[PDB]
Write a protein that binds this DNA or RNA. Sequence first.
DNA 1: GGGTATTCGCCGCGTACCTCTCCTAGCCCGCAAGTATCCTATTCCTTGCAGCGGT
Length: 53
Amino acid sequence: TPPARRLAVKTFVREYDSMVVREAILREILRGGQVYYLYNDVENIQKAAERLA
DNA sequence: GGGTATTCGCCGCGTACCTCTCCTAGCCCGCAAGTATCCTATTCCTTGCAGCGGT
């Protein structure tokens, strides 16, 4: 049930694309919110974060 | 042509009864059963450099 203003989290299952990631992150940033970017690999998480930067 | 000889291939080789063993190889496909990497707890310790009493 509610909490009242919960909104139907939209699900998109896309093949990986740099443009899609950039567009989503910029859309969230321009909104003022925050993005979770789940990588789930501590070995290469530093490289992944550096590349996303 | 043809009468003859020579070869080649097919057909055939008893009855009755008793004991025993053994009747495809291999592939495939799905079950299912047993394994290498990722986070939050745990027990395992061994160094590096500055304070610091003390004289």
